[PDB]
Amino acid sequence: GRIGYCFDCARACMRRGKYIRTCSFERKLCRCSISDI
Amino acid sequence: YVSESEPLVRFKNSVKITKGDLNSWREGTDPCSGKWFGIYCQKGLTVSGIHVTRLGLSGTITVDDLKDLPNLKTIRLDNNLLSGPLPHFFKLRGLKSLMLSNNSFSGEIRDDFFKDMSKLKRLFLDHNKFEGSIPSSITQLPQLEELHMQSNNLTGEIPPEFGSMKNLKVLDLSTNSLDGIVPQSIADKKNLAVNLTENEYLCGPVVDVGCENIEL
Amino acid sequence: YVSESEPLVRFKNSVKITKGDLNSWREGTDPCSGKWFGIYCQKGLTVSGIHVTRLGLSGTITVDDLKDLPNLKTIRLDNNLLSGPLPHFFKLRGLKSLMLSNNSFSGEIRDDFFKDMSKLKRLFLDHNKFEGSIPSSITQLPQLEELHMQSNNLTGEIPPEFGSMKNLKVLDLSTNSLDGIVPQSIADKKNLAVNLTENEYLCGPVVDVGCEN
């Protein structure tokens, strides 16, 4: 589902040291910030 | 001037006011006397601006009577109930400020809409229901200093030609569904206050969003 | 801007490049990247000028694609092989500088050609095959600073309005076929450099027609 997908997106951004910025489950889009946490 | 009362009374009689009135607009009197609601005059002599806000104006606006006011520079119709496509303000080629914030104007604005409005300095189209792409002629306005189009339903990419607008100091395109990549020309523009937030699929510098899709 | 590559590639394809190429002009790229040969841009952002010289440009050029460049101010096509009438550059109402020196443009220029070119400041029509009279619209160019029509085949009288011109600093009409009477209203000046040399039939007193072939 969408909530689990965007949880995994938030974790991916954290592993890159960024903030989650964009998450779309239906488009399978996950984008993080350029700035650092 | 007293002669300017005639086009203004016609304009009054062409609009539908649902919250208030324009009874102060009395034909055969000078609109610059101080007695006319929402009239601004240059040096108290000639009509230069019309500010008719919060009167529940409904339906559309036509400009065929406003064009008879030779010195009209400013039109403000904010906070009304107007609907339909953008009225033909491009027939007022001398206009310097157009403010239509917080109405229900709709539709995609014709790409060449603004071609004739060479004197426009301020353009407020925010809090409406405009759709489709930002019309390319907006970036060709030689004198434009402020563009507000926030809170609409715009889509598509932001034209990079905004970055070449010599006088542009305020650019608000927030709360739309603009997409693509923020033009570097806008990110690099000196002395620009720009707001591109709440455009979900827009990425790049100014929005602090990496374009890369992380596939996890 | 990438949107400006389309009309330039169309312009490139509309002329025949006999002696060189414009390989740098690549569709889908920004002509202000710093890589396009012969392109000027305003602040590295938008196309402002084209200067394509000594490429053996042959045939006729049309202005239907250059009109799509909103911020184009300067055109230089010197030292090429262009021919035919003077192209309809008056469509580019914002053009500030037009340089067509050393081509094979011909015919008589329409008198009212330059009426709409108000912003024009530099006009180089020298070293061509222009015929007929000097178009009087040139004399009513508001911002015109320099006019170079030398080494053509022009005829007729020099218009007196050249000496009432706002900002005109150079007027070179050398080596033509002008005649009539030298206006005193051009000899009076304010820092107007005038080269009327090699135009023999201009003498004010219409005397006996010596040296007549």
Numbering used by the authors:
A (entry chain C): 14 to 50
B (entry chain B): 27 to 242
C (entry chain A): 27 to 239
Please share text taken word for word from the publication where this structure appeared:
Orthologs of LURE1 in Torenia concolor (TcCRP1)15 and A. thaliana (AtLURE1)9 were recently shown as key attractant molecules, indicating a significant role played by these secreted proteins in pollen tube guidance. By contrast, our data showed that the LRR-RK PRK6 expressed at the tip of pollen tube is an essential receptor of the same attractant peptide and important for targeting of pollen tube to ovule in the pistil. In the current study, we present biochemical, structural and functional evidence showing that AtPRK6 functioned as a receptor of AtLURE1, strongly supporting previous genetic data. Sharply contrasting with other LRR-RKs, AtPRK6 recognizes AtLURE1.2 through the C-terminal loop of its LRR domain rather than the LRR portion.
In order to probe the recognition mechanism of AtLURE1 peptides by AtPRK6 at atomic level, we solved the crystal structures of the AtLURE1.2-AtPRK6LRR complex crystallized in two different forms by molecular replacement. The AtLURE1.2-AtPRK6LRR protein complexes in the two crystal forms display a nearly identical structure. Two AtPRK6LRR molecules exist in one asymmetric unit of the crystal with higher resolution. Interestingly, one of the molecules is in an AtLURE1.2-free state. The C-terminal loop of the apo-AtPRK6LRR including Cys237 and Cys229, is disordered. In contrast, these two cysteine residues in AtLURE1.2 bound AtPRK6LRR form a disulfide bond that is involved in interaction with AtLURE1.2. These structural observations suggest that the disulfide bond-stabilized C-terminal loop is likely important for AtPRK6 LRR interaction with AtLURE1.2 in vitro. The C-terminal loop of AtPRK6LRR is mainly responsible for its interaction with AtLURE1.2. Arg83 of AtLURE1.2 is located at the center of the AtLURE1.2-AtPRK6LRR interface by being sandwiched between the C-terminal loop and C-terminal extension of the last LRR of AtPRK6LRR, forming hydrogen bonds with the carboxyl oxygen atoms of Tyr227 and Cys237 of AtPRK6LRR. Additionally, this arginine residue tightly stacks against the disulfide bond formed between Cys229 and Cys237 of AtPRK6LRR.
